[PDB]
Write a protein that binds this ligand. Structure first.
Ligand SMILES: [Mg+2]
Ligand SMILES: [Mg+2]
Ligand SMILES: [Mg+2]
Ligand SMILES: [Mg+2]
Ligand SMILES: [Mg+2]
Ligand SMILES: [Mg+2]
Ligand SMILES: [Mg+2]
Ligand SMILES: [Mg+2]
Ligand SMILES: [Mg+2]
Ligand SMILES: [Mg+2]
Ligand SMILES: [Mg+2]
Ligand SMILES: [Mg+2]
Ligand SMILES: [Mg+2]
Ligand SMILES: [Mg+2]
Ligand SMILES: [Mg+2]
Ligand SMILES: [Mg+2]
Ligand SMILES: [Mg+2]
Ligand SMILES: [Mg+2]
Ligand SMILES: [Mg+2]
Ligand SMILES: [Mg+2]
Ligand SMILES: [Mg+2]
Ligand SMILES: [Mg+2]
Ligand SMILES: [Mg+2]
Ligand SMILES: [Mg+2]
Ligand SMILES: [Mg+2]
Ligand SMILES: [Mg+2]
Ligand SMILES: [Mg+2]
Ligand SMILES: [Mg+2]
Lengths: 97, 95, 155, 210, 54, 100, 127, 82
RNA sequence: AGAACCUUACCUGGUCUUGACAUCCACGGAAGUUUUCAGAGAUGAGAAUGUGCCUUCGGGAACCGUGAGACAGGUGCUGCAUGGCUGUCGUCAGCUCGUGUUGUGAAAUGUUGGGUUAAGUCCCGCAACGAGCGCAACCCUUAUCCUUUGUUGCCAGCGGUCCGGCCGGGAACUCAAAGGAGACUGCCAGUGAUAAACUGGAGGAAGGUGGGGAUGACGUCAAGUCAUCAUGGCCCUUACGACCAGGGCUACACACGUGCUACAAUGGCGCAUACAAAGAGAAGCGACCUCGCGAGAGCAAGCGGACCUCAUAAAGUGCGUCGUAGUCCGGAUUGGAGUCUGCAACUCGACUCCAUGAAGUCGGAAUCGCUAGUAAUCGUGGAUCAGAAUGCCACGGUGAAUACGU
């Protein structure tokens, strides 16, 4: 089983990882290493004056962070627990068999 | 001397155009090498105003004047540029 | 500028003849960042310089260079209503830069077919005191000689 | 000249966001319009509850909304009659099951947004603008602000010409990024038109991103 | 642009220029005796040259 | 934006996604080379009949706060102005000033 | 017992392995003279060897990814000078004096708002 | 121009009211805002007064006018000179 | 940050009047759904079908239609009544306050003086003593190294191979991203007021603010915006409000500004062949296959993506040709023939093929940009967006010139 973790904060994500790679160890299973992935950086430019003045801008950004964790030898026990976990708000997870 | 007229809150009729052109024709005697020049006329509430900017041979001269009419505004303006143009000339013909 | 520019650059020497001098000469001919194109044009000229003088390349291209380097240039200085042309020594490195520039400038202003031909011919003519390049130096030198009286002003 | 929004600049460095969820483009614009509405509603009808901040999270097909106040009693009610009402009529517009919490603001005088309105209220009651401004800077420093600045601007005392006046005392270093400075504004609606108010409160410098 | 020019040389040429233009010694802006020596040094060299100029 | 202008956008959305299928399939035959000349010719008359405001190209993204028609951003559904205003409060998760 | 460097210039990265031998070179499963048309490139690649005359006393093996020609060529040189002063902690000082040991750093400047490029700014004629 | 496969475009309203012209022979001019519509062969012989923005203007259709689009015969700007 | 319609605020003509957009009240009718006709359409008149969910025996809850009037509505006016936001001098090194002292007083001192610095930077003096807003530092990025983790990324040593990281393996290396290490005038000479600093040297990936960004003092210009929004006042209310079709914003004797492409041989054309970065995609990015000279069409894998797709970088390089011509330079203009988006491309789209083949031979007076991975030059992506970049915002490739000096 693979779970991909994704979020806007980096401290926040490096929690959920540690949380999951604690349970996986708990409910007897081998977890194949939290491996980080390229972080997408959507960028935006906007006129900051409400009229005229083209050369006056802000440059905004959203950094998305991706993490991947595997499940080597999925115990029957684990599959329920790693499914049943209330996980920090503002974090998307995608467990997929 | 190539001219250009604007109106910011003023309709440029064909006195105010004809008038302004004649008044500006003098300035060349103060300095022969005037190039393109832009004029702007304003009316804000009660204040009549007239500014122009003059591209000259190695410079940029600007002034603005306020009248109770626009004619009196432009009359004032021409006296301001005259003095600046003479100052310019004299710090080139500086021997 | 008002302060001193710190940090001079590093010209790599030529791939062939391994000279920083010739490497500069390429840059000067180079256009729009096309260093390879210029690298070709230069060598093909020296070929055709070598193939007639029969006097090496890094030693022939030199002889052109000596016929054309100036030793005294004029600086302009506004005095009263007038402008004083005044003679000054030329720095060694500068007179290299000028020679190499005048050679290139003279080349381009010709009717020959290739660029390589123009350069070659010009370098050859240079070696026998002939082309526009060498004409220019002569003229420079004439002017500094004329208004020698203003040699020692510091103003 | 113009000045950067002191909250905005310090967002990652030393401040939090007010809304903290994650979404893909598909539902990103939709969570924004949803949030807007809930704030638009809450602030409207908690007007008189002294509310500082409405931080609002979307955990997993849901929404918990945790709304800072210096009068929690009035928000809660008689063992939570009003709170559940709010809950009922948020889930209404959030489009999902909602739950609500009540954070406690201990020192309302050291809260940029609270003090900002405090003034805006006084000004609405034809109070002298210098008195309002002067009072605030006292209160703040009295309770351990390391600094405080309040600006007010518009047609002060109904004057035919508009101007801008401000007092500071203590440190308010806007260029220092780790400096926790709390900033917020409030428009006041006198009969002469809008008087804008702005407030900066320095609480000291921080040594850790957290 | 990256680093300030020699202070002594500059001081010597400032001296020269006040010299030729005919200001008095005792306009010298330096009390740092080191720079001062450069300034006057220029100013006196310049006094020679003025003579043979018109 | 004038209340009216905000409104038209609702009239226009509603239709667009009610006749959505009718248009699609009624278009689908038009572009079918291998179909009855009788059919396709009918269709051309039939599409032009059902109402204009029911076309998706007829609508205009307006800020869903102020109604502005210009300087829209899809990611937020807001104008450049309101995006900035909200950005600075921290009402847009993640978003923040950027340097590189 | 093979000695290794990484090496970077502009956007290039060059992982290199040297071994004692007669003076072979491979870049990305290819020979020097093949991979690099330009002459400059070649000069640059071997000039650390040409310095400490091991031109034909060691046999090199390379791969590069990213950048253009003068980037890769440059990145390789750095790669060698790293390995070549690791096989021999001795040579450093000589290598260093040639200025091969430093990693260049010069990157392309970003485009900025209001400008046509990094520093080129749109015309306005006082004409 | 319109793809060949999609056939020639005419607004229906106008398409209809040049059956009654051609079947139930009339001899009146027809009003129309249908500047889109291309001229079909049926339209040969019938004046039809197409809108230009402020006024309708008569276009006595002919063989030569076939395929072109009505509005291609109702100029919409006035200019004499300067 | 993208006017065919829409947008749209304008013009012409056709309509509407408690109104297109709300709350309140009475009355009627579930809401929907499917049709014909007239009309440019708005709209008007018909026709079919339908009778729902808690309702405790009155139905309330929908959501629709008519009626009354408290009202809604206005991109109408004033940016010289305002808030908010923004340009500008200027990322210039300034601008001030408390107490003390001096002066009848406006004021002054501090903030001057000697040095120093990018810097009111720092030091030493001194009727000043202190403090604050700025300066610098804290933030992001880039340059080197180390730890942890290793798939969708990686292949040094092995073994196998359909020779394709392709396979078993490997966790080295490149790279991905969390956490750390590092640069401080710290170390060494010489100068210097036993200072502050300066100039040079060492090591080091980097040296003196390493490079680039973010960050804009008190104020100035009744600068800009009542058409983003809000808002004092004033004005309109069967019309300055509302709906619709067509047109207009794309008009052309002309003047000015910003760009693109050229005028050729450091080049045009044909064949052959190398090396990037950054970014986008959900009902979207759309391969492979078939069709077509081509724009494209049909069919339909994979991919919410370090995996799939956009999507083959170009200049470069080799071989050939053209031979200095208004040319095998240029590609404007125009005819013919198409494709695609879209109710719809006449006014007014982008692109394709065939034909056409203009001005232009390097630009008067004037005038602009740029000091290094910069200028110059070459390609790539994105936002807006049904379709509509030579603009804007980003990304790499190649890669100079010259600074004596004031
Ligand atoms: Mg992506
Ligand atoms: Mg007079
Ligand atoms: Mg700003
Ligand atoms: Mg409104
Ligand atoms: Mg549209
Ligand atoms: Mg611009
Ligand atoms: Mg570039
Ligand atoms: Mg229109
Ligand atoms: Mg009308
Ligand atoms: Mg103003
Ligand atoms: Mg105005
Ligand atoms: Mg006294
Ligand atoms: Mg001062
Ligand atoms: Mg003072
Ligand atoms: Mg003083
Ligand atoms: Mg001083
Ligand atoms: Mg200071
Ligand atoms: Mg050093
Ligand atoms: Mg700073
Ligand atoms: Mg004004
Ligand atoms: Mg219309
Ligand atoms: Mg226009
Ligand atoms: Mg160009
Ligand atoms: Mg051609
Ligand atoms: Mg796109
Ligand atoms: Mg084919
Ligand atoms: Mg500079
Ligand atoms: Mg380009």
């Amino acid at each position: 089983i693979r779970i991909r973790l994704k979020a806007f904060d980096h401290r926040l994500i490096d929690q959920a990882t540690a949380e999951i790679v604690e349970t996986a160890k708990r409910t007897g299973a081998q977890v194949r290493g939290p491996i980080p992935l390229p972080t997408r950086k959507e960028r935006f430019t906007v006129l900051i004056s409400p009229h005229v003045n083209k050369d006056a801008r802000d440059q905004y950004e959203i950094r998305t962070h991706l993490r991947l964790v595997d499940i080597v030898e999925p115990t029957e026990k684990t599959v329920d627990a790693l499914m049943r976990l209330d996980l920090a708000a503002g974090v998307d997870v995608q467990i997929s068999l | 001397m190539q001219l250009n007229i604007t109106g910011n809150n003023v309709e440029i009729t064909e006195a105010l155009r004809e008038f302004v052109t004649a008044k500006f024709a003098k300035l060349e005697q103060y300095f022969d090498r005037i190039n393109q020049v832009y004029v702007v006329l304003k009316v804000e509430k009660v204040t009549h105003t007239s500014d122009a900017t003059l591209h000259v041979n190695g410079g940029e001269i600007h002034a603005s004047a306020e009248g109770q009419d626009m004619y009196a505004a432009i009359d004032g303006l021409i006296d301001k540029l005259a003095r600046q143009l003479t100052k310019h000339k004299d710090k080139l013909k500086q021997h | 500028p008002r302060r001193r520019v710190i940090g001079q650059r590093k010209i790599l020497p030529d791939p062939k003849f391994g000279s920083e001098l010739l490497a500069k000469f390429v840059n000067i001919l180079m256009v729009d960042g096309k260093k390879s194109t210029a690298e070709s044009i230069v060598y093909s000229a020296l070929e055709t310089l070598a193939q007639r003088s029969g006097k090496s390349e890094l030693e022939a291209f030199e002889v052109a260079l000596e016929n054309v380097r100036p030793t005294v240039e004029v600086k302009s200085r506004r005095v009263g209503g007038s402008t004083y042309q005044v003679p000054v020594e030329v720095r060694p490195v500068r007179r290299n830069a000028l020679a190499m520039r005048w050679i290139v400038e003279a080349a381009r202003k010709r009717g020959d077919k290739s660029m390589a031909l123009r350069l070659a011919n010009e370098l050859s003519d240079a070696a026998e005191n002939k082309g526009t390049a060498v004409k220019k130096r002569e003229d420079v030198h004439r002017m500094a000689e004329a208004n020698k009286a203003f040699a020692h002003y510091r103003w | 000249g113009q000045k950067v929004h002191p909250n905005g600049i310090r967002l990652g460095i030393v401040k939090p966001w007010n809304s903290t969820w994650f979404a893909n483009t598909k539902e990103f614009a939709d969570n924004l319009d949803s949030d807007f509405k809930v704030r638009q509603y809450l602030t409207k009808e908690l007007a008189k509850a002294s509310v500082s901040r409405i931080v609002i999270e979307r955990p997993a097909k849901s929404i918990r909304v945790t709304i800072h106040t210096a009068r929690p009693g009035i928000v809660i009610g008689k063992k939570g009659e009003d709170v559940e009402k709010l809950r009922k009529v948020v889930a209404d517009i959030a489009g999902v099951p909602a739950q609500i919490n009540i954070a406690e603001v201990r020192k309302p005088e050291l809260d940029a947004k609270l003090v900002a309105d405090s003034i805006t209220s006084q000004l609405e009651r034809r109070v002298m603008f210098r008195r309002a401004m002067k009072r605030a800077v006292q209160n703040a420093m009295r309770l351990g602000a390391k600094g405080i600045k309040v600006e007010v601007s518009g047609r002060l005392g109904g004057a035919e010409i508009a101007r801008t006046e401000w007092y500071r005392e203590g440190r308010v270093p806007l260029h220092t990024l780790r400096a926790d400075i709390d900033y917020n504004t409030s428009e006041a609606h006198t009969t002469y038109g809008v008087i804008g108010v702005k407030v900066w409160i320095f609480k000291g410098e921080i040594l850790g991103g957290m | 642009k990256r680093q300030k020019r020699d202070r002594l040389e500059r001081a010597h040429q400032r001296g020269y220029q006040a010299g030729i233009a005919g200001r008095s010694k005792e306009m010298c802006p330096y009390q740092t005796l080191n720079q001062r020596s450069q300034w006057l040094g220029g100013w006196r060299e310049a006094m020679a040259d003025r003579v043979v100029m018109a | 934006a004038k209340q009216s202008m905000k409104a038209r956008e609702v009239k226009r959305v509603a239709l667009a996604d009610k006749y959505f299928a009718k248009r699609a399939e009624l278009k689908a035959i038009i572009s079918d080379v291998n179909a009855s000349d009788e059919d396709r010719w009918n269709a051309v008359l039939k599409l032009q009949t059902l109402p204009r405001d029911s076309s998706p190209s007829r609508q205009r993204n307006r800020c869903r706060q102020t109604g502005r028609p210009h300087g829209f951003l899809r990611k937020f559904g807001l104008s450049r102005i309101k995006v900035r205003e909200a950005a600075m409060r921290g009402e847009i998760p993640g978003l923040k000033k950027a340097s590189w | 017992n093979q000695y290794y460097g990484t090496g970077r210039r502009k956007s290039s990265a060059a992982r290199v392995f040297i071994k004692p031998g007669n003076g072979k070179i491979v870049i990305n499963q290819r020979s020097l003279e093949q991979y690099f048309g330009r002459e400059t490139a070649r000069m640059v690649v071997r000039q650390p060897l040409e310095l400490v005359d091991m031109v034909e006393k060691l046999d090199l093996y390379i791969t590069v990814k990213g950048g253009g020609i003068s980037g890769q060529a440059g990145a390789i040189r750095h790669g060698i000078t790293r390995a070549l002063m690791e096989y021999d902690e001795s040579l450093r000082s000589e290598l260093r004096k040639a200025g091969f040991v430093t990693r260049d750093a010069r990157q392309v400047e970003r485009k900025k708002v209001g400008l046509r490029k990094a520093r080129r700014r749109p015309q306005f004629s006082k004409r | 121009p319109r793809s060949l496969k999609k056939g020639p475009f005419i607004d229906l309203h106008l398409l209809k009211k040049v059956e009654k012209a051609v079947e139930s022979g009339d001899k009146k001019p027809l009003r129309t805002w249908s500047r889109r519509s291309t001229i079909f062969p049926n339209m040969i012989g019938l004046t039809i007064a197409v809108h230009n923005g402020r006024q309708h203007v008569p276009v006595f259709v002919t063989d030569e006018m076939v395929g072109h689009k009505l509005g291609e015969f109702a100029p919409t700007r006035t200019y004499r000179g300067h």
